[PDB]
Amino acid sequence: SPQPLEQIKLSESQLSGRVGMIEMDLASGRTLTAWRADERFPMMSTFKVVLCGAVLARVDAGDEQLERKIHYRQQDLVDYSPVSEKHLADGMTVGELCAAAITMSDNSAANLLLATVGGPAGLTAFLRQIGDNVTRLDSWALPGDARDTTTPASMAATLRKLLTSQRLSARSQRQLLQWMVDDRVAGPLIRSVLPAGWFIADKTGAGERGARGIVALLGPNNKAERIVVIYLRDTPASMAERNQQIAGIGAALIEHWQR
Numbered sequence: 523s524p525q526p527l528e529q530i531k532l533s534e535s536q537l538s539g540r541v542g543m544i545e546m547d548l549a550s551g552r553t554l555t556a557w558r559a560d561e562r563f564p565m566m567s568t569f570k571v572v573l574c575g576a577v578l579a580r581v582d583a584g585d586e587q588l589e590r591k592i593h594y595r596q597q598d599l600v601d602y603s604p605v606s607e608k609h610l611a612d613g614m615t616v617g618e619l620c621a622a623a624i625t626m627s628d629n630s631a632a633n634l635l636l637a638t639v640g641g642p643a644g645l646t647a648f649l650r651q652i653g654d655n656v657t658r659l660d661s662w663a664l665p666g667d668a669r670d671t672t673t674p675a676s677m678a679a680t681l682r683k684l685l686t687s688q689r690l691s692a693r694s695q696r697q698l699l700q701w702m703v704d705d706r707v708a709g710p711l712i713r714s715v716l717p718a719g720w721f722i723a724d725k726t727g728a729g730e731r732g733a734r735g736i737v738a739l740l741g742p743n744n745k746a747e748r749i750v751v752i753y754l755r756d757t758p759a760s761m762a763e764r765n766q767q768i769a770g771i772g773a774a775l776i777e778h779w780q781r
């Protein structure tokens with residue numbers, strides 16, 4: 523592989539789209555690689571991590587419990603509900619909802635959780651509270667449309683704040699991390715192509731006009747050493763090719779880790 527920056531450029535050339543990327547030390551926030559890091563990209567399903575960060579903040583505050591069972595009706599389901607569609611009779615706990623939202627990208631689960639935090643406005647106020655003045659959720663992907671967007675730099679900083687600053691309790695930090703470790707959409711596939719010793723936790727996203735993304739923890743020696751945030755937008759490429767390009771940026775990181 524070429525150097526990370528060289529590969530990121532090759533990916534834009536090959537995809538005819540914009541790539542946005544930041545590689546950041548999880549413990550300190552040291553930024554190693556930053557490309558279009560202040561440009562806006564659609565968050566897609568990656569918002570579900572921030573959502574559950576807000577849910578955990580309510581738990582910490584004593585205004586929510588992960589045990590609490592939510593009952594919902596079939597009429598409340600939205601498109602793509604692989605887990606939530608199975609519990610019309612018995613409901614799901616708030617904690618189960620977050621697991622389903624993060625690990626399966628369950629949209630009904632995310633929708634039910636979003637209500638509990640005051641909707642898109644409420645989640646955006648949560649972001650402003652933790653010092654993210656850029657990321658915004660507006661909805662329960664055209665150029666010029668800033669709705670439901672973040673930047674690589676903002677998303678990386680926010681993920682670091684949620685996982686490591688003392689904004690969430692120790693138990694809540696550990697919970698948010700474990701949900702990302704447990705990703706079923708891409709986690710196991712990623713492990714299958716990762717060399718031995720490499721840690722992965724992640725949340726993926728996909729959307730219109732080629733939108734595709736991942737927010738992840740990666741490192742050698744089985745450690746969550748770095749946050750890596752990669753977003754793509756405005757490419758006509760197949761899903762398979764978008765995946766391959768993101769994987770190629772991963773390969774360049776892996777080969778050239780010591781920077």
Ligand SMILES: OC[C@H]1O[C@H](O[C@H]2[C@H](O)[C@@H](O)[C@H](OCCCCCCC3CCCCC3)O[C@@H]2CO)[C@H](O)[C@@H](O)[C@@H]1O
Nearest residue numbers: 712715716717736738740750752768769772773776777
């Ligand atoms: O010298 C480093 C390594 O080089 C190769 O490993 C390859 C691997 O065989 C391939 O499967 C992967 O593809 C990259 C797949 C990563 C996909 C997910 C990455 C995510 C994670 C973080 C967010 C961005 C993308 O690249 C590495 C580096 O060339 C050798 O196979 C391996 O023995 C060796 O230890």
Ligand SMILES: *C(=O)/C=C/N[C@@H](C(=O)O)[C@](C)(COC(=O)CCCC(=O)O)S(=O)O
Nearest residue numbers: 566567568601602627629707726727728729
């Ligand atoms: C989150 O990014 C959601 C992406 N797409 C879904 C949506 O718009 O709600 C779909 C239903 C596809 O969802 C999946 O394939 C599950 C994995 C999505 C993910 O990577 O998180 S829609 O067809 O695009």
